[PDB]
Enzyme design. Sequence first.
Site, short mmCIF file in Angstrom:
data_model
loop_
_atom_site.label_atom_id
_atom_site.label_comp_id
_atom_site.label_asym_id
_atom_site.label_seq_id
_atom_site.Cartn_x
_atom_site.Cartn_y
_atom_site.Cartn_z
N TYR A 162 -12.27 26.02 34.87
CA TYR A 162 -13.12 27.08 34.29
C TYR A 162 -13.89 26.66 33.07
O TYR A 162 -15.03 27.07 32.86
CB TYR A 162 -12.26 28.32 33.89
CG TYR A 162 -11.69 28.95 35.11
CD1 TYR A 162 -10.39 28.61 35.54
CD2 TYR A 162 -12.46 29.84 35.88
CE1 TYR A 162 -9.88 29.15 36.71
CE2 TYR A 162 -11.94 30.42 37.06
CZ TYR A 162 -10.67 30.07 37.45
OH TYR A 162 -10.14 30.62 38.60
N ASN B 170 0.28 26.55 43.02
CA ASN B 170 -0.97 26.72 42.30
C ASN B 170 -0.70 26.88 40.82
O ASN B 170 0.15 27.69 40.43
CB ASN B 170 -1.74 27.95 42.82
CG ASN B 170 -3.19 27.96 42.36
OD1 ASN B 170 -4.01 27.19 42.86
ND2 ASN B 170 -3.50 28.84 41.43
N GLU B 171 -1.42 26.10 40.01
CA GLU B 171 -1.41 26.15 38.54
C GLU B 171 -0.03 26.13 37.88
O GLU B 171 0.32 27.06 37.14
CB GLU B 171 -2.23 27.34 38.02
CG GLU B 171 -3.69 27.26 38.39
CD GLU B 171 -4.54 28.22 37.61
OE1 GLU B 171 -3.99 29.21 37.09
OE2 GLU B 171 -5.76 28.01 37.50
N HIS C 80 2.06 31.16 44.73
CA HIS C 80 1.09 31.44 43.70
C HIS C 80 1.72 32.49 42.76
O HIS C 80 1.23 33.63 42.67
CB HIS C 80 -0.19 31.95 44.38
CG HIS C 80 -1.44 31.83 43.56
ND1 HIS C 80 -1.57 32.35 42.28
CD2 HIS C 80 -2.65 31.32 43.88
CE1 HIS C 80 -2.81 32.16 41.86
NE2 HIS C 80 -3.49 31.54 42.81
N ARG D 244 -9.35 29.85 51.04
CA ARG D 244 -8.03 29.54 50.53
C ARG D 244 -7.32 30.83 50.07
O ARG D 244 -7.78 31.50 49.16
CB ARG D 244 -8.15 28.53 49.38
CG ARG D 244 -6.83 28.04 48.77
CD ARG D 244 -7.20 27.71 47.33
NE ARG D 244 -6.01 27.45 46.65
CZ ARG D 244 -5.77 27.60 45.37
NH1 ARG D 244 -6.70 28.03 44.49
NH2 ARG D 244 -4.55 27.30 45.01
N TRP E 250 -3.90 39.46 36.52
CA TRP E 250 -2.64 39.32 35.79
C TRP E 250 -2.57 40.24 34.57
O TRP E 250 -2.79 41.45 34.73
CB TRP E 250 -2.39 37.84 35.46
CG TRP E 250 -2.55 36.95 36.70
CD1 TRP E 250 -3.52 35.99 36.90
CD2 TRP E 250 -1.72 36.94 37.90
NE1 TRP E 250 -3.35 35.40 38.14
CE2 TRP E 250 -2.25 35.95 38.77
CE3 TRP E 250 -0.60 37.69 38.32
CZ2 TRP E 250 -1.69 35.66 40.03
CZ3 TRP E 250 -0.03 37.41 39.58
CH2 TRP E 250 -0.58 36.39 40.42
N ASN F 252 -8.39 23.33 39.54
CA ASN F 252 -8.81 24.70 39.20
C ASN F 252 -9.45 24.63 37.82
O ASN F 252 -8.75 24.48 36.79
CB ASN F 252 -7.59 25.65 39.23
CG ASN F 252 -6.95 25.74 40.60
OD1 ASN F 252 -7.63 25.64 41.64
ND2 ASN F 252 -5.63 25.89 40.64
N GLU G 162 -10.51 26.40 42.50
CA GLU G 162 -10.93 27.59 41.72
C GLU G 162 -12.01 27.19 40.74
O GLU G 162 -11.92 26.15 40.11
CB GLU G 162 -9.78 28.18 40.89
CG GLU G 162 -8.63 28.74 41.70
CD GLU G 162 -7.55 29.19 40.79
OE1 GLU G 162 -6.47 28.61 40.80
OE2 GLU G 162 -7.78 30.12 39.99
O1 LIG Z 1 -5.84 30.96 29.75
N1 LIG Z 1 -5.95 30.01 30.77
O2 LIG Z 1 -6.26 28.69 30.45
C1 LIG Z 1 -5.75 30.38 32.07
C2 LIG Z 1 -5.85 29.43 33.09
C3 LIG Z 1 -5.65 29.81 34.41
C4 LIG Z 1 -5.33 31.12 34.73
O3 LIG Z 1 -5.14 31.46 36.04
C5 LIG Z 1 -5.22 32.08 33.72
N2 LIG Z 1 -4.92 33.38 34.00
O4 LIG Z 1 -4.70 33.80 35.30
O5 LIG Z 1 -4.82 34.29 32.95
C6 LIG Z 1 -5.44 31.70 32.39
C1 LIG Z 2 -6.65 30.70 38.69
O1 LIG Z 2 -7.40 31.42 37.72
C2 LIG Z 2 -7.81 32.74 38.13
C3 LIG Z 2 -8.65 33.29 36.96
O2 LIG Z 2 -7.85 33.22 35.78
C4 LIG Z 2 -6.54 33.57 38.45
O3 LIG Z 2 -6.90 34.92 38.75
C5 LIG Z 2 -5.82 32.90 39.62
O4 LIG Z 2 -4.63 33.59 40.02
C6 LIG Z 2 -5.44 31.46 39.27
F1 LIG Z 2 -5.13 30.83 40.43
#
Ligand SMILES: O=[N+]([O-])c1ccc(O)c([N+](=O)[O-])c1
Ligand SMILES: *[C@H]1O[C@H](CO)[C@@H](O)[C@H](O)[C@H]1F
Lengths: 491, 491, 491
Positions: free
Chosen positions: B323, B179-180, B134, B90, B452, B321, B396
Site C-alpha cells: 500500500y 495472508n499478512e 486470513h 483471490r 477490521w 501486499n 493486494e
Molecule cells: O497499518 N498497516 O500497515 C496495515 C497493513 C495491512 C493491513 O491489512 C492493515 N489493516 O487491515 O488494518 C493495516
Molecule cells: C490487506 O490489507 C487490506 C487493507 O488494509 C485488508 O482489508 C486485508 O484484510 C489485508 F489482507
Amino acid sequence: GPVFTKLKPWQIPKRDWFDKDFLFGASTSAYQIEGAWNEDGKGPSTWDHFCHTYPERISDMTNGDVAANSYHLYEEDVKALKDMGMKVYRFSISWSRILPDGTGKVNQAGIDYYNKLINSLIDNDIVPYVTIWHWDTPQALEDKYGGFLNRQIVDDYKQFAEVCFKNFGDRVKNWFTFNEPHTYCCFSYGEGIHAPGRCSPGMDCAVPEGDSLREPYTAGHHILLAHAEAVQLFKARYNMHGDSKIGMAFDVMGYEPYQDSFLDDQARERSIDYNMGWFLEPVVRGDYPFSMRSLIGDRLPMFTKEEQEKLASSCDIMGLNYYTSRFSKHVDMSPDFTPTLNTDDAYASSETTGSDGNDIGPITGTYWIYMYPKGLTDLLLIMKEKYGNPPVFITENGIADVEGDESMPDPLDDWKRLDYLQRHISAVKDAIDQGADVRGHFTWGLIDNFEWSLGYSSRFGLVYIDKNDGNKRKLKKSAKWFSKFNSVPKP
Amino acid sequence: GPVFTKLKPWQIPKRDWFDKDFLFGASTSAYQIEGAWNEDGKGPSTWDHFCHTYPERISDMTNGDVAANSYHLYEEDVKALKDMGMKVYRFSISWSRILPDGTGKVNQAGIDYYNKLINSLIDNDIVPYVTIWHWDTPQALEDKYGGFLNRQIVDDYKQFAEVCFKNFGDRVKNWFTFNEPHTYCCFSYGEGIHAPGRCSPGMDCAVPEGDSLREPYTAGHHILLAHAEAVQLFKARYNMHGDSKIGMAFDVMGYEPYQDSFLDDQARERSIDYNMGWFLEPVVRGDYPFSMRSLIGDRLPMFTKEEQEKLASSCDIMGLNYYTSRFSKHVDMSPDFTPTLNTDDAYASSETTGSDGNDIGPITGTYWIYMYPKGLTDLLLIMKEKYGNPPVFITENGIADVEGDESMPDPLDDWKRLDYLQRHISAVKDAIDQGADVRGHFTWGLIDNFEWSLGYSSRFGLVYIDKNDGNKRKLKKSAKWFSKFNSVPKP
Amino acid sequence: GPVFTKLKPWQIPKRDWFDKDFLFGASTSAYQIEGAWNEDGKGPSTWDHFCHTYPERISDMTNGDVAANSYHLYEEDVKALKDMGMKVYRFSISWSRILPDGTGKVNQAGIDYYNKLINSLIDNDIVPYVTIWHWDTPQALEDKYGGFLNRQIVDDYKQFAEVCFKNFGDRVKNWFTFNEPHTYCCFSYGEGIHAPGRCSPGMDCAVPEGDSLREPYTAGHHILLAHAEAVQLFKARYNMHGDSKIGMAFDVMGYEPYQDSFLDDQARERSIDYNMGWFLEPVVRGDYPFSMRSLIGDRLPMFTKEEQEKLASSCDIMGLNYYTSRFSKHVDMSPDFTPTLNTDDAYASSETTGSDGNDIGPITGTYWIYMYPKGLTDLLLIMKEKYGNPPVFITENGIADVEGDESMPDPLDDWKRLDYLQRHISAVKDAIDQGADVRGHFTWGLIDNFEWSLGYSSRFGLVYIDKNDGNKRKLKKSAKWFSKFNSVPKP
Ligand SMILES: O=[N+]([O-])c1ccc(O)c([N+](=O)[O-])c1
Ligand SMILES: *[C@H]1O[C@H](CO)[C@@H](O)[C@H](O)[C@H]1F
Ligand SMILES: O=[N+]([O-])c1ccc(O)c([N+](=O)[O-])c1
Ligand SMILES: O=[N+]([O-])c1ccc(O)c([N+](=O)[O-])c1
Ligand SMILES: *[C@H]1O[C@H](CO)[C@@H](O)[C@H](O)[C@H]1F
Ligand SMILES: *[C@H]1O[C@H](CO)[C@@H](O)[C@H](O)[C@H]1F
C-alpha cells in the site's frame, strides 16, 4: 614455486602518478627498533616485562632489549630515509622512556633523544609524524592498576600526551594517538599472544586469568576515552597556530564475501564493522557500530553523551594500516555456536580461501600476508563513501621475508616486497582516481625490526639490519627502487 | 486541497504493457465479505468473538455478521469480476465454516458453498487463487489452547489445509497458506487492536494479559511451522499432476532512509528485515533475518534443522501486499531506549515525514496510506536481486475512501483510487522492465468490505456495496476503467 | 517545528575539500552597508530617493541613510573578514558617491574612501572583488532621462566604469559590471517594489505609470549594452598587464519540473532561460535565449551585429547568486492566458510546492528561501555542459534570520544559516567533482544589512550588526565556524 607473478614494467608506479603534495614515507615503532630498554633512566614497558618474564612466548626467543639499537643509531635511520628520498618518517615515542613510572617525573634523557631525532629529520628535509602510543605501556601502570583495563589509564595517557605536545609540538605538527587498537585488543587481551599476555582460563597464553570476551572491549573503551581526552586538550591548547593535525591509525583487513549470497554480504559488513568500525566509527560518530552493540551488548561499554560528543569528529587525519584481505563467511546465531573469543562476536569467520576453493591471493612470506591489493582500494572507497572522505594516510603497508623461506636466500634481493609495494601504491592511485582523499603511503617498515611474538624471524624492512655486522643498515632492492622513484641525486 | 495530481493521459497503463500470461485480478477475504457468520452450522471465529465481546474495539461499532453477504450473493461478486474483465479472483476459505470446532467434523454446507463459488468462477473464465487462512481462526481452538500461541495449531492447521486440498484441489491450482503474518502478529498480539486483541499489561487493548514483546513472535513461529507442514503435505500428496503452486502472501511497506547517512541506510535494512524478512526469509533460507535474531534473541524461537530444511524453498509463488512506504530513522542501542512493543525491536522508527520535513507522498484517504509507488518497484527489485527472483504476485494493492472525507462525496467517483492504481500498475511495469519476475496484480478489494478495527467506514472496493440498497454491487469509476483496460465487449 | 535536520558531522565540508587556489569570501553592496548617504559631497541614488519619497514601500519603514555605517566603520568589516580567515571580499562602488551628478565632476572624497578600503584589504591579505553597479543609479540621471530606460545610460555608465578602472585598477584585478540584472528588472520595473518603483497602471507600486511588459526589457537591454561598452574599454585600455578579469553576476534559481512529463521539462527550460539565460546568454553568444525572443517578440529589443559581437564572450568570470529553487509548471498558450507582468512571458509558473504536494525543501526564515542545494549543483553543471564551462564564482549564497521568528531568539546562534552554508559548500564540491569550473564561494552577506523592501528585518550576515550598540560587529556562530574552517590562528 609458489607462483609469484610480477607487474609488467609499464604497470609500475611513477612518482608523478601522485600530486606534488602526496607524501611517501616509512614507519617504525619504539619497542621494535630502539633497544636501550633500561638505559639513561628508562623504565620498563609491558613489552619489556612480557619478554623478560615469558621469553618462550617469542618465537625465536628474542626480545627488544637492543632491537636495531636506534636509540644510539638513529642517525643511520635518518640517512636511510634520505638515501631513499622519503619525505615523511612515522616513528613512535616510548612512554616508559619519557615517564619511567608512567606518571610523575619526566626523564630528560628521553626528551633529549626524541629532540635529536626530530631535529635530524628536519635538518634532512624529512617531516616527522609521531605515534604517541604503540602498545608500549609503562609496566609501572600495569602493576599499579592493570594498565588499559583501568579508567585511570585515561588521565595518565592524557598527561603523557601533554608532555609530548609541550616538548615536541613546536616542530612535530602531525600526531597519531594510538596505533592498531583492534590488533592490540584482540592479541593482548583476547588470544593473549601479545603483552600483557592475557586470555580466559583454560586458554593457552602466558596469563590465562583474564576474559577473552570482556577485557578486549574494556581495553578498547579506555583507548577511545584516552584518545578523546588527548585530542580535546590538543585542540584547546596545542594547535594555537591552526596548522597541527591529530588522528588515530587503524589496522584494517579487506573483506570479500566467502560465497556469492546476501548472507555473506551481510557477514562481510559485520567483519568490516568489527575490524575497522570498532575504533573508526567512535571517532567519526561517537559510538561503536550498531552491529557490535547488537551482538556484544553488556560486554561493550556505553559512552556518556559528553563522551560521544568528545569522540565524534576527533580525528583530523586517519591512518590505515593495511596488509591483506580475507573472505568473510556468515555464522548463524544458534545454540550450536557460543562465542569464547572476542573475534567470535562478529558472527563472520575470516577465511583465507573462498567458496571456489582458491586462496584470496598469493602468499608473500609470513603465514598471514596474502597479497590482495583490491582490498585496499575497496576500503579506501568505504572511507570516501561512508565516512565522509576524511584525509587518509596508509600508515603501514608491506610484507615480511621470513627466516627459512628457501625462495628468499638473499635478504637484500627483496623483489617480492618491491612488487607487492608497487601493486599497493598502484591500488592507492586507483582510489585517488576514484575520488578517495589519500594523502600519503608509509611502508612498514623503514628497517627490519622486532616483529612481536615472531621476534626477528620476520623481516619487514626496506632496509636490512645486519644483526651479525653491528646492526648495520643496508639498502635492499626495494629501498634502491625508492631512490630511483623519488629521483634522489646520485653520488 | 489537499493537492492530488493525476497521471498525464499518455502515462496511463495499457493492458498490452504486460505480456499475455500476466494476470489482473482482485482480492477479498472470508470474514470481510461473507457474512452468514452462524449460518448452516458455521462455528465462530476469533473475529466473530472479538467483535461480539468487545464491540467498542471497532471504530463505527459494526462487525462482519453480514458484511457484503457474499455467502448468499457470491454470484454478484463473480459478475463484477466478469464485468471488469478480471482473469483471477483471490478469495479466502473460512476455517470456522469448514470445521466449526476447528478440528473434527467437516461442515458439508461449508464445502458446498466454496464449490459453488469455485465452479461459478470457472464457468466464467476466472481462475481461483485461494488463501487458506486470513486471520480467521476458529474460536474453538482459541478457547481450547490459545490458538496460534500453542503448538497444537500447527497440526490443526495442517488438517484444515488438507480438507481444502482434498475438496478443492482438483480445480484450485494456486494457494496461499497465510495472508499478512507480520500485520497479524503486530496488531493481534503486539498492539492488540485486532482479534484476539492481546497486549502487555498496562496497554490499551481489549485483553492486556499478554506480552507485546513475546506473543507476536510465538504466533509468527507457529504460522511458519504450520505453513511448512501444509506445504510438505501438499507437495507429497496434492501436486501429483505437477501443475499446482503454493506460497504465502506478505504485507510489505517500502522504506527510504529518513536522512542521507549510513546509519539510516542501516535502519532501512532493519525495517525491511522486520516488515518483510520476518516471514519471507524463513520460507527462502529456513531462518529469520540475522538482524532480528541479533536484536530479539531468546524472544525469537529457534528452528530445528529439520524445520529449517522444511521451510527453505517452501514457496512456489510469493504474494506481496503493498500500500505505502515510510522513512526509516535509526534508533541507537542505549539505556535510554527499552523496547516495549515488538516493533521497537527493529531499532528503526517508521516515519511518514522525512529529514527535509516533507511527507513521503500524498495522503489518499485513510491515515496510513501515503502514495509512493517507487517503494513497490524498489521492493520488487529486492525480491529479484536478493531473494532469487521468485514468481511474485501483487496480491493486494489499493486505497480506502473514508466516510467523512469531504473531498470524496460520491462513493462511485473514485478517480483518486483509479489514479493510485494506474501509478502502481505502472510501477509493476517498471519492475518487470528491470527484470523482476512479477506475474500478476490483484487490487484490494473487489468490493467494499469490513475493514477490521475501522469497520465499514473505510471503503477499499473497485465495486461499491450499497449497504442501504440490499448490499447491491455498483461498479465505481475505477471498475469501469478496468472494463476498458481489459477490452470487455460492450452490451 | 518546523523540522530542521542538520548535516551529520562527517558530512561537514573541510577547507581541503577544495584546492589551494579556491577562494572563500563574503559579499556586500554599497547602499546596503555604507550609510553616509549625503556625506562629503555624495549625491542621491535612486534608492535614497525611493526610500525618502515612498518610505512606506519599506517593510519596517527604515532606509539606508546609515545602514551599517561602513563609510566610517569599514575597518571593522575588514577585521571581520580577517577574523573569519576569508580570502576575498566582494563589495560595490557607489556611483552617486563617485559622480554625484551621474556624469561630470568626480567626488575625490568618494575616491579616497574606496582607496582606503582597498588598501586596508590588501594590507590584510584579502583580495578585493568589485561590483561596479548594484542597483545604485544616481537620481540625477533618473531625473535627467529616466536612468536605465534611456540609451544615454550606456555611455554614462561606461564613463563611470572608466573612473573606477583608472583609480582602482592598479590594485583591483577582478570586476563585476552589474549584479542581479534579472532581479533588478523584475522588481524595479515589473512589480515595482524596488527603486525607482515602476509598474503598469492599475498595479500596486509607488509609481504605476510604467509598463510591466516593456520597461523590464528596455532596462535589461541597456544594462547589456552598458556592460558590452565597459568590457570593450576595459580589455582595450585597462588590462595591459593581462592579469585582470571582468564579468557579470547573475541571480539564479534552480528549477525542477512540477510534474514528471515532457511539458514541465519544457517549462523548466523556459524558466531557466528566463531567470538565468536572459542576461547570461547575451554575454555568451551575443543574443537573448530563443525561447524569450519567440514569446516576447517586439517587446524584447534586437541587437545590431556590432552589438552581438561586442557582447559575445564579454565575461572572463561569471558570478552566480544562488539562494533557492522552484518547481516549474507549464502554462499553455491560449486566449485564457494574457501576460500582464514580464515574468508571465516564460509561460512557466514558479511553484514552491510540487505535484506530490511537498514544498521543494525546508523554509529557512524569510518566505522565499526554501533550502534545495541540489538546485545549485544542477545549475553549475548547466554552466559546464551548455555554456562552455566558464570560470564561475558563487558570488552570493546564504539565508535570512527574520525579526519575529520565535525559532531564532538569539541572533548570534545562527546554526541554521551555518547548516545551509555547509550544505551549499558541499553542493559546490559535488559540482567541482563532476568537472564544473567553480573558483570560489562568497557568502551573502558579510554583515547584516539593509534588505531592500524588507529593511533591517531580514538579517543575512555572518556577522551581526548590533544596531542598538553603535552598529558594533559581532561574529555569529557561522562566522566562528569559518574561523575554524579557514584555520585562523587563535589569540
Ligand atoms: O497499518 N498497516 O500497515 C496495515 C497493513 C495491512 C493491513 O491489512 C492493515 N489493516 O487491515 O488494518 C493495516
Ligand atoms: C490487506 O490489507 C487490506 C487493507 O488494509 C485488508 O482489508 C486485508 O484484510 C489485508 F489482507
Ligand atoms: O595478524 N594480524 O592481522 C596482525 C595485524 C597487525 C599486526 O601489527 C600484527 N602483528 O604485529 O603481529 C598482526
Ligand atoms: O525574490 N528573489 O528571487 C530575490 C532574488 C534576489 C534578491 O537580491 C532579492 N532581493 O534583494 O529581495 C530577491
Ligand atoms: C603494524 O604491523 C606491523 C607488521 O605486523 C607491526 O610490526 C607493527 O608494529 C604494527 F604497527
Ligand atoms: C543578492 O541577494 C541578497 C539577498 O536577497 C541582496 O541583499 C543583495 O543585494 C543581492 F545582491
